[PDB]
Amino acid sequence: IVCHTTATSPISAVTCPPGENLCYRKMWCDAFCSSRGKVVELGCAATCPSKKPYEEVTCCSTDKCNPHPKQRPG
Structure with a gap:
């Protein structure tokens, strides 16, 4: 499965299958996020x-x- 990675600038889709059936955005507040x-x-x-109880780990298998938020959830 092709999944989005934060390992690249800018954030890009990479073909991950060997150890990957899922893609995720693992997003959480560090300090007060909005600021x-x-x-x-x-x-x-x-x-x-x-x-995932505190981390919005939006996992998906496609x-x-x-x-990344901006792209669709924002």
Whole structure:
């Protein structure tokens, strides 16, 4: 599956299958977001990662399904 990565500038879709059935945007507030930062991580994994109770880990199993906020959720 092709998934969006934050590992590239600008944030881009990468073909991840070997250890990846899912795409995710793992987005959470660090300090007060709207002013003081949001940790938005666009990645690939076979699993929905790091603590989704507080992290908006919008996991999905399709090509380009995890958009960086601006792209579709904003």
